[model samples]
Target chain A: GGYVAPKAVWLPAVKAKGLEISGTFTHRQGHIYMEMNFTNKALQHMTDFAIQFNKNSFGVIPSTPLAIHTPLMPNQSIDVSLPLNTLGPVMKMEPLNNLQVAVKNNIDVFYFSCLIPLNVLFVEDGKMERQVFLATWKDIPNENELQFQIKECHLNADTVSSKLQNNNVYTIAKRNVEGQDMLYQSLKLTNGIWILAELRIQPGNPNYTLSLKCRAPEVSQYIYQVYDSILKN
Target chain B: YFPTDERSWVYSPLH
Candidate 1:
């Protein structure tokens, strides 16, 4: 999933009192992972901090509110994880601009937006076979929209293939033509979007090239996330 | 099926 939060919003009221809060969002497998952290700067020990989302807008996986019961001392920080699952088909039907969260302490309540796109909230393995890629490319009229080139990825062909395979992205077809290795993988996203990714690698070149073609370009950013994950590893 | 329209909120004390 491509749920990248551009910025963290701190509660104005809490910030004035030296209580800081921030969050991060990511998608792994079938779950939307949200990490919320709290930093207390106030002199007194703070207690009973809780977070709740608008029921109409957000849903958690096991239906639990994110709360911290232990008293937080001065200069101390605590973080909690919120695993969420999409409530309805609204995520696939339309763009999810942001999620509203209500943060509460013993005295005051504050609200903030956890910004993310719904399509980017579903986990995508980011694999595709050559045949599947070709088929999807032919089916989609906008060929130019589906292509992306990342020259900065200084990854070898074999390493890229192995990394993908290690992540459960199996190669359905492989060929060696004129000393160039072509690996084709077909990956299906949680949203049922089929993707075709072709890896072209040549010997002695540290940087390999990848060609991705998909029907839904809006939700195809996960492919880049997969590549990023591979390169980071 | 995903839980939709189950807008009931779970209230929990920070204990």
Candidate 2:
């Protein structure tokens, strides 16, 4: 199979005319969660709200009518959450990968499945400590490392740190090294693999130098692609 | 620093 950049999907309402259903994939703490919110805008009551996804897709999501034991009255919105990593580690996008969500009321039903990209399906960083990071950094070989520039270097050190944290690449440490700025980060993929990054830049230098190391050499390379994808826009 | 081995501590928690 060809390489595809990892991403998860968000959706518009699968039902309208009073029943509104919207969902998004969220990764928080150490797990991936699917949050679905439903609102009733019409002047009636919608009961027996059934929330589910395709049963055929295995343990990736909930299968049909979970315990939504309430009704959505007018101008009311109810949000429910489900964990999508029951199978553990990481999810492979093959042999039925997309999640088909079915939302049903007492008399109406609507459907849609948000396809989760393999790259977007990583766990949050393990929050490794500085001393441990140093030890592990040396333990990891130099073969997986690569140095490159960020072209425009639009983001300063602080902005770069914020953006990376939002994307699940938690910063382990940051300081100045002999007047050069340094940033260290740790990222763990859903496959239970860790990718460590070291970035440095001189003051007023638009171009920065960065390197990545991981247990899997090929995946370490792929994570560089992930960083490019996030920083491009 | 403690002794380190290639790829040994990569999978194990360094903490």
Candidate 3:
């Protein structure tokens, strides 16, 4: 027989002993949802398990410090869901690359981290027409830092648009302007910041330019991160 | 056992 390495060896052994934990991110009604699952594989009854997130710009709404009061016997599992709300100006200007989840009992403590991709956070639920796009761009200050371009990407306009839609990002409006395709989209971040994006796809060229503007400068900084994330995906 | 301090358990809203 061929030797095969156990996948569990890489995980936090003490925290995952006799237990299974998993989590994912979701969006609903302008809220970022963190759905988690926990299973007990031990034969003995287990209790005093709690779940918490590391300090960040966002927080769980309605309640926090989620704890499991009931004892779970062997092969029992429980599901927990947390909806995160943005803290507005209080939010720190930081990239949300990974989220830390702490699970602990009386004796053993475990920490699990999950990456929440930028595309997952910047969700497009609405569209914008040419008039709206132009008006918005004109109204926003022409700050040197607010506008950015990437010449390396040979991105196809149609392909990128379709990918955005496939990722649950609804197209608000698109049109052809000055022999080029222009797309306007409204994206909402998990931290409750709304971002407006304008994409100009040059005719007969693979390169495209994306301009993003937000009401707050702090939120605008994340546009580059979101663009980079989309390019990678 | 849970913490005795109510503040520890209460959810802190980000300003």
Q: In order, what is each prediction's RMSD in angstroms?
A: 6.0, 12.5, 7.9
Interface RMSD of each: 7.0, 21.7, 10.2
Candidate 3 docking: what grade? incorrect
Clashing residue pairs in candidate 3, if any?
A: A127-A172, A128-A172, A128-A173
Off by over 4 Å in 3: A1-11, A14-20, A29-31, A41-44, A60-69, A74-79, A87-94, A119-135, A144-159, A162-173, A177-179, A190-192, A215-221, A224-233, B1-15
For model 1, how does the per-residue alpha-carbon lDDT over A2-101 read when each residue is reduced to its tens digit? 3254537455435437677776766665556676678877887766665555543233332466656677788998887766665522332223344555
DockQ of each: 0.20, 0.01, 0.10
**How far in Å is the alpha carbon of A160 misplaced in model 3?**
3.4
Considering summed lDDT, which 10 consecutive residues are worst modelled in model 1 chain A? A88-97
Question: Which one wins by TM-score: 1 or 2?
Answer: 1
| lDDT tens per residue, model 3, A149-176 | 6456666777777766655444577799
Candidate 3 colliding pairs, count: 3
Which rank order by DockQ, best down to worst?
1, 3, 2
Model 2 TM-score, 2 decimals: 0.55
Q: Report lDDT (CA) for all predictions.
A: 0.58, 0.61, 0.57
Select the stronger candidate by DockQ from 1 and 3: 1
Best by lDDT: 2
